Amino acid sequence: SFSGYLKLTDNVYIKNADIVEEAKKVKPTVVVNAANVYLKHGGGVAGALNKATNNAMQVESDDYIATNGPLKVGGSCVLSGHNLAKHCLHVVGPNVNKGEDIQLLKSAYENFNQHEVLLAPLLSAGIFGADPIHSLRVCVDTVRTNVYLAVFDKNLYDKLVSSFL
Numbered sequence: 001s002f003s004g005y006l007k008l009t010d011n012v013y014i015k016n017a018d019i020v021e022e023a024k025k026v027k028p029t030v031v032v033n034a035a036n037v038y039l040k041h042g043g044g045v046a047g048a049l050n051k052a053t054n055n056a057m058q059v060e061s062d063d064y065i066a067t068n069g070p071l072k073v074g075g076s077c078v079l080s081g082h083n084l085a086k087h088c089l090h091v092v093g094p095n096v097n098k099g100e101d102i103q104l105l106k107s108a109y110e111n112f113n114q115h116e117v118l119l120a121p122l123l124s125a126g127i128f129g130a131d132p133i134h135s136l137r138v139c140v141d142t143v144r145t146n147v148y149l150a151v152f153d154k155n156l157y158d159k160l161v162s163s164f165l
């Protein structure tokens with residue numbers, strides 16, 4: 001299903017791509033959302049994935065929170081993938097701009113290990129305020145299942161690749 005990815009390790013793949021467009025095209029078993037603990041999908045990856053579901057992800061998420069309460073930072077829940085995927089794994093990476101502990105990034109990535117294959121963004125990057133080069137390192141040192149990383153920004157993609165150890 002997936003095409004055009006650079007192989008970084010035995011199990012981590014990366015591509016310069018819009019995760020929304022990739023989800024729509026591939027319809028993978030699991031797409032990862034870069035969520036917050038309230039599953040309020042306002043901006044960033046979450047805002048874009050939600051908009052691609054015509055707000056159906058937000059409606060489902062509102063029901064989830066009403067029933068179960070908020071996630072923990074570093075935690076996850078599995079919901080519908082709607083039109084993008086079979087399932088959406090909503091994962092909460094720490095938001096450095098809210099002062100959340102960057103050490104929880106490894107816990108966040110550990111959620112990915114419950115799924116054999118996933119399409120995902122770099123956790124805690126973008127508006128979550130962490131260094132994406134750090135995030136990718138934590139990814140490669142934590143995830144053991146097959147992860148296809150979609151990086152929207154071409155300059156960031158190039159830097160992630162060119163700096164990868």
Ligand SMILES: C[C@@H]1[C@@H](NC(=O)/C(=N/OC(C)(C)C(=O)O)c2csc(N)n2)C(=O)N1S(=O)(=O)O
Pocket residue numbers: 121122125126127131132150151152153155156
């Ligand atoms: C240059 C990238 C920029 N990334 C983005 O803004 C990028 N958003 O998010 C992430 C998740 C990082 C991505 O590119 O996958 C995006 C989505 S739609 C658009 N026009 N740009 C960001 O703060 N950096 S930095 O290299 O980590 O400074």
